[PDB]
Design a binder for this molecule. Structure first.
Ligand SMILES: [Cl-]
Ligand SMILES: [Cl-]
Ligand SMILES: [Cl-]
Ligand SMILES: [Cl-]
Ligand SMILES: [Cl-]
Ligand SMILES: [Cl-]
Ligand SMILES: [Cl-]
Ligand SMILES: [Cl-]
Ligand SMILES: [Cl-]
Ligand SMILES: [Cl-]
Ligand SMILES: [Cl-]
Ligand SMILES: [Cl-]
Ligand SMILES: [Cl-]
Ligand SMILES: [Cl-]
Ligand SMILES: [Cl-]
Ligand SMILES: [Cl-]
Ligand SMILES: [Cl-]
Ligand SMILES: [Cl-]
Ligand SMILES: [Cl-]
Ligand SMILES: [Cl-]
Ligand SMILES: [Cl-]
Ligand SMILES: [Cl-]
Ligand SMILES: [Cl-]
Ligand SMILES: [Cl-]
Ligand SMILES: [Cl-]
Ligand SMILES: [Cl-]
Ligand SMILES: [Cl-]
Ligand SMILES: [Cl-]
Ligand SMILES: [Cl-]
Ligand SMILES: [Cl-]
Ligand SMILES: [Cl-]
Ligand SMILES: [Cl-]
Ligand SMILES: [Cl-]
Ligand SMILES: [Cl-]
Ligand SMILES: [Cl-]
Ligand SMILES: [Cl-]
Ligand SMILES: [Cl-]
Ligand SMILES: [Cl-]
Ligand SMILES: [Cl-]
Ligand SMILES: [Cl-]
Ligand SMILES: [Cl-]
Ligand SMILES: [Cl-]
Ligand SMILES: [Cl-]
Ligand SMILES: [Cl-]
Ligand SMILES: [Cl-]
Ligand SMILES: [Cl-]
Ligand SMILES: [Cl-]
Ligand SMILES: [Cl-]
Ligand SMILES: [Cl-]
Ligand SMILES: [Cl-]
Ligand SMILES: [Cl-]
Ligand SMILES: [Cl-]
Ligand SMILES: [Cl-]
Ligand SMILES: [Cl-]
Ligand SMILES: [Cl-]
Ligand SMILES: [Cl-]
Ligand SMILES: [Cl-]
Ligand SMILES: [Cl-]
Ligand SMILES: [Cl-]
Ligand SMILES: [Cl-]
Ligand SMILES: [Cl-]
Ligand SMILES: [Cl-]
Ligand SMILES: [Cl-]
Ligand SMILES: [Cl-]
Ligand SMILES: [Cl-]
Ligand SMILES: [Cl-]
Ligand SMILES: [Cl-]
Ligand SMILES: [Cl-]
Ligand SMILES: [Cl-]
Ligand SMILES: [Cl-]
Ligand SMILES: [Cl-]
Ligand SMILES: [Cl-]
Ligand SMILES: [Cl-]
Ligand SMILES: [Cl-]
Ligand SMILES: [Fe+2]
Ligand SMILES: [Fe+2]
Ligand SMILES: [Fe+2]
Ligand SMILES: [Fe+2]
Ligand SMILES: [Mg+2]
Ligand SMILES: [Mg+2]
Ligand SMILES: [Mg+2]
Ligand SMILES: [Mg+2]
Ligand SMILES: [Mg+2]
Ligand SMILES: [Mg+2]
Ligand SMILES: [Mg+2]
Ligand SMILES: [Mg+2]
Ligand SMILES: [Mg+2]
Ligand SMILES: [Mg+2]
Ligand SMILES: [Mg+2]
Ligand SMILES: [Mg+2]
Ligand SMILES: [Mg+2]
Ligand SMILES: [Mg+2]
Ligand SMILES: [Mg+2]
Ligand SMILES: [Mg+2]
Ligand SMILES: [Mg+2]
Ligand SMILES: [Mg+2]
Ligand SMILES: [Mg+2]
Ligand SMILES: [Mg+2]
Ligand SMILES: [Mg+2]
Ligand SMILES: [Mg+2]
Ligand SMILES: [Mg+2]
Ligand SMILES: [Mg+2]
Ligand SMILES: [Mg+2]
Ligand SMILES: [Mg+2]
Ligand SMILES: [Mg+2]
Lengths: 174, 174, 174, 174
């Protein structure tokens, strides 16, 4: 037993490792979207940068779970980071739809971890999730939903002018 | 009788209370429009902020009538603030059309109050309306009319790209 | 179903709308107290300003619930804002007693909403209430209780000098 | 006829001269109150300064009527400035009551001048009164009424501690 460990269930330790892997998986998916929008035959630079920044944020989420695991006396166990579901992402609308689904998958895993922490009577882990993860997911989901609404209004997928304008006006200029 | 009261007719006092209620009603309508444009399935942020700011301005108009009432020795009497006419506002064009109508309803009430103040030979109340309310209404009505003209030019309600562009270019970026 | 909605029960959505209305009701009550203390026959300016600021804070509380509703994919539904219970508030002691009761009514509604969120296993809503609402209520209740103790010490309601001194020394000079 | 004169009735010219005299009369009354509160057996310095400043303001009001008269092509005609009604002013409450009455006498004269200007179809004179005089009177009357309410709350005339506290806290420290 780690000398620091107190009130930390083995099941929670394992679930934190699984959650870490999912954050890394999400990072990698976002990195793939970055590279896609940077292609010369796609060329939506601001969209590409949005996904690159999302990729970096997910890596930070993963690192924060590593630090958490060690703070509680659990042991980080890494698994393979699976490659993303697609090699090409269609267009801004398809990519944003995939991002929404991914953020909701991540959110569900966080909510499930909170259920487990609640079941094991671990208020520190509950606090950590509530204070560092759950609101970030709600914000991200809202942002991406708002984007999808605007992409549909702009006539995606068919309206190339609409897609061009989204990249100029809806995402940060990079 | 209030020790400060001088040349202030009971009818004017009552009409000021009714006008206060109408300002609060207008505030609440604008708040509803804010919340509508903030919906994930509407997502026109700058339009939402325009209405939020309008809501705040109407609350200031109401507070200024409360202060006025007390300065003259009248007594503030509050009534229920009725909920807005609609729960959802369609799109930017429909909302702006409703806003134009609301501003003209408020303006008519102010003009009617000025008629009453004139009839009761209350130059202080006339001055107050002319100096603090009537020009603000004319300016607001002109601004919203100009917006409606531009929304029609942009192809509302059908042209979603037009609606997107209005939010980017016609209202302040927030 | 809203594209953003996840783990958000219909009952919680409805209770958030009811809570929004109560915040607006509280705002309106505080606005009435402001106008009362601004009367020429009451004339306790610092007390009036305390209530005006409280009114503004409650409106901010309401707006934060509107934003929350939309973040979760619920839909804001507004009802009439009922006028306050009284048209005149007696004196500083009676008004502070009414304010204490109102803050405890608001607090009970927030606690009841937290119970519902707990029952529906909504940790995001629990966090929101705990992080943005519950401590603010405890602080406000303590502040107003402290004021009431001091008003009683100062001989309210009979001791007019005591009431005068409270306005000079216990509430912020405005 | 003055070369500048246009739309300026003889009756209005005369009434402006009478109003000028009343402003000077009010100034002189306030000067008397200043000297009273500066007496060693009265010794309420902040109250004295309040009245001294009021005296100066009334002289400015008079000078503005002189300038107005000449701008319109009327001719300033001065009469004696009558001494104030009392040689001693009792206490802060009695003086404030006299000040309230004086401000309402001045206000009535201004309102009567506005009636005359209206009757003679002189919108410039109406504007001048509304923009430079009528709101100043409403503000002054409200301020003095608020003071009287507070003096009564503080137990005037009998409560000397109350009178002392009013001078420290209700009027500007000089
Ligand atoms: Cl343990
Ligand atoms: Cl334990
Ligand atoms: Cl264990
Ligand atoms: Cl593991
Ligand atoms: Cl794993
Ligand atoms: Cl593996
Ligand atoms: Cl596998
Ligand atoms: Cl996919
Ligand atoms: Cl693929
Ligand atoms: Cl997914
Ligand atoms: Cl889990
Ligand atoms: Cl727990
Ligand atoms: Cl968070
Ligand atoms: Cl947010
Ligand atoms: Cl957007
Ligand atoms: Cl299209
Ligand atoms: Cl198209
Ligand atoms: Cl957008
Ligand atoms: Cl009257
Ligand atoms: Cl009159
Ligand atoms: Cl009347
Ligand atoms: Cl009324
Ligand atoms: Cl009403
Ligand atoms: Cl009502
Ligand atoms: Cl009704
Ligand atoms: Cl409508
Ligand atoms: Cl509707
Ligand atoms: Cl209307
Ligand atoms: Cl009217
Ligand atoms: Cl008039
Ligand atoms: Cl105006
Ligand atoms: Cl203008
Ligand atoms: Cl425009
Ligand atoms: Cl079109
Ligand atoms: Cl179209
Ligand atoms: Cl425009
Ligand atoms: Cl749901
Ligand atoms: Cl869940
Ligand atoms: Cl549900
Ligand atoms: Cl509801
Ligand atoms: Cl309700
Ligand atoms: Cl209702
Ligand atoms: Cl009802
Ligand atoms: Cl009550
Ligand atoms: Cl009542
Ligand atoms: Cl209550
Ligand atoms: Cl509830
Ligand atoms: Cl929960
Ligand atoms: Cl809080
Ligand atoms: Cl505290
Ligand atoms: Cl206190
Ligand atoms: Cl006492
Ligand atoms: Cl007493
Ligand atoms: Cl003191
Ligand atoms: Cl205190
Ligand atoms: Cl002439
Ligand atoms: Cl003419
Ligand atoms: Cl003439
Ligand atoms: Cl003359
Ligand atoms: Cl004279
Ligand atoms: Cl003479
Ligand atoms: Cl004489
Ligand atoms: Cl006298
Ligand atoms: Cl005398
Ligand atoms: Cl007089
Ligand atoms: Cl006259
Ligand atoms: Cl005229
Ligand atoms: Cl003025
Ligand atoms: Cl004022
Ligand atoms: Cl005062
Ligand atoms: Cl007393
Ligand atoms: Cl006494
Ligand atoms: Cl002090
Ligand atoms: Cl005072
Ligand atoms: Fe993440
Ligand atoms: Fe208004
Ligand atoms: Fe509140
Ligand atoms: Fe004057
Ligand atoms: Mg060891
Ligand atoms: Mg284990
Ligand atoms: Mg996994
Ligand atoms: Mg594989
Ligand atoms: Mg937080
Ligand atoms: Mg946004
Ligand atoms: Mg009275
Ligand atoms: Mg009446
Ligand atoms: Mg009405
Ligand atoms: Mg109804
Ligand atoms: Mg103006
Ligand atoms: Mg313009
Ligand atoms: Mg949908
Ligand atoms: Mg429902
Ligand atoms: Mg309710
Ligand atoms: Mg009712
Ligand atoms: Mg917490
Ligand atoms: Mg906190
Ligand atoms: Mg304290
Ligand atoms: Mg000549
Ligand atoms: Mg003449
Ligand atoms: Mg005279
Ligand atoms: Mg004489
Ligand atoms: Mg007329
Ligand atoms: Mg006029
Ligand atoms: Mg003015
Ligand atoms: Mg004041």
């Amino acid at each position: 037993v780690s000398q620091v460990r107190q009130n930390y269930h083995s099941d929670c330790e394992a679930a934190v490792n699984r959650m870490l892997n999912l954050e890394l998986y999400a990072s990698y998916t976002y990195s793939s979207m970055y590279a896609f929008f940077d292609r010369d035959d796609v060329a939506l630079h601001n969209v590409a940068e949005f996904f690159k920044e999302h990729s970096h944020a997910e890596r930070e989420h993963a690192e924060k779970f590593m630090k958490y695991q060690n703070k509680r006396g659990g042991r980080v166990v890494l698994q393979d980071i699976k490659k993303p579901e697609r090699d090409e992402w269609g267009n801004t609308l398809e990519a944003m739809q995939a991002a929404l689904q991914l953020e909701k998958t991540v959110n569900q895993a966080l909510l499930d971890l909170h259920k487990l922490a609640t079941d094991k009577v671990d208020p520190h882990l509950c606090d950590f999730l509530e204070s560092e993860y759950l609101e970030a997911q709600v914000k991200a989901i809202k942002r991406i939903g708002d984007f999808i609404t605007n992409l549909k209004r702009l006539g995606l997928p068919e309206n190339g002018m609409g897609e061009y304008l989204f990249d100029k006006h809806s995402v940060k200029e990079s």
